[PDB]
């Protein structure tokens, strides 16, 4: 009532594309507990790396690392299908407990991070400075990442839809599409958002028939 224990900075994990995803937001009063269900990036992925971050920067690499830990034993499935619930829990004493739980396998891995770990009172103030100083640049990075994830979903999805369409797809369209996928896959390898959107444009246009067959 005269004071508050708060989180100076946001706390969370690194997610597909090097993005920091936030669990517990800046200036939250402890004790506190937030959960979020995540999934796997890649097909038949048997583990996930839980990389714990402190900071306000969109790029995981610009934020302060507090440790990382694996949850193994993820039973084979398509990417985006496993349920990994991730829980940040700050008790009344300032200690952070992060758990990942595979909601199919029941398996669990925790890490426990001292109240003292992470950025000192100064670093905190610098981090907020950089957040507002690099807002524009963080935004641009977010849009590239989101665009790369949009690109990759369109690629992964279209390849499946070609496998299940088999002989249904006119060889002609299958030629046009397999060329747009190879180019899309190359562009995804770069940092040019415009060029990824242009290969996504190329795929859309030549995939009208494939799309029909998926129904």
């Amino acid at each position: 009532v005269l004071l508050l224990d708060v989180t100076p900075l946001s706390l969370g994990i690194e997610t597909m594309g090097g993005v920091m995803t936030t669990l517990i937001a800046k200036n939250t009063t402890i004790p506190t507990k937030h959960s979020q269900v995540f999934s796997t990036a890649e097909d038949n992925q048997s583990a996930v790396t839980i990389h714990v971050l402190q900071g306000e920067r969109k790029r995981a690499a610009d934020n302060k690392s507090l440790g990382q830990f694996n949850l193994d034993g993820i039973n084979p499935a398509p990417r985006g299908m496993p349920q990994i619930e991730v829980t940040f829990d700050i008790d009344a004493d300032g200690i952070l407990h992060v758990s990942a739980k595979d909601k199919n396998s029941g398996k669990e891995q925790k890490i426990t991070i001292k109240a003292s770990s992470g950025l000192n009172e100064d670093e905190i103030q610098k981090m907020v400075r950089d957040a507002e100083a690099n807002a524009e640049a963080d935004r641009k990075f977010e849009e590239l990442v989101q665009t790369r994830n949009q690109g990759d979903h369109l690629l992964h999805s279209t390849r499946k839809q070609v496998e299940e369409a088999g002989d249904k797809l006119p060889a002609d369209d299958k030629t046009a599409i397999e060329s747009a996928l190879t180019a899309l896959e190359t562009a995804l390898k770069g940092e040019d958002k415009a060029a990824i959107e242009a290969k996504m444009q190329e795929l859309a246009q030549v995939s009208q028939k494939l799309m029909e067959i998926a129904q």
Binding site: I13, E14, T15, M16, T21, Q36, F38, S39, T40, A41, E42, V48, T49, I50, R79, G80, I84
Partner: peptide, 4 residues
């Protein structure tokens, strides 16, 4: 949201 997906982890690697």
């Amino acid at each position: 949201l997906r982890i690697a």
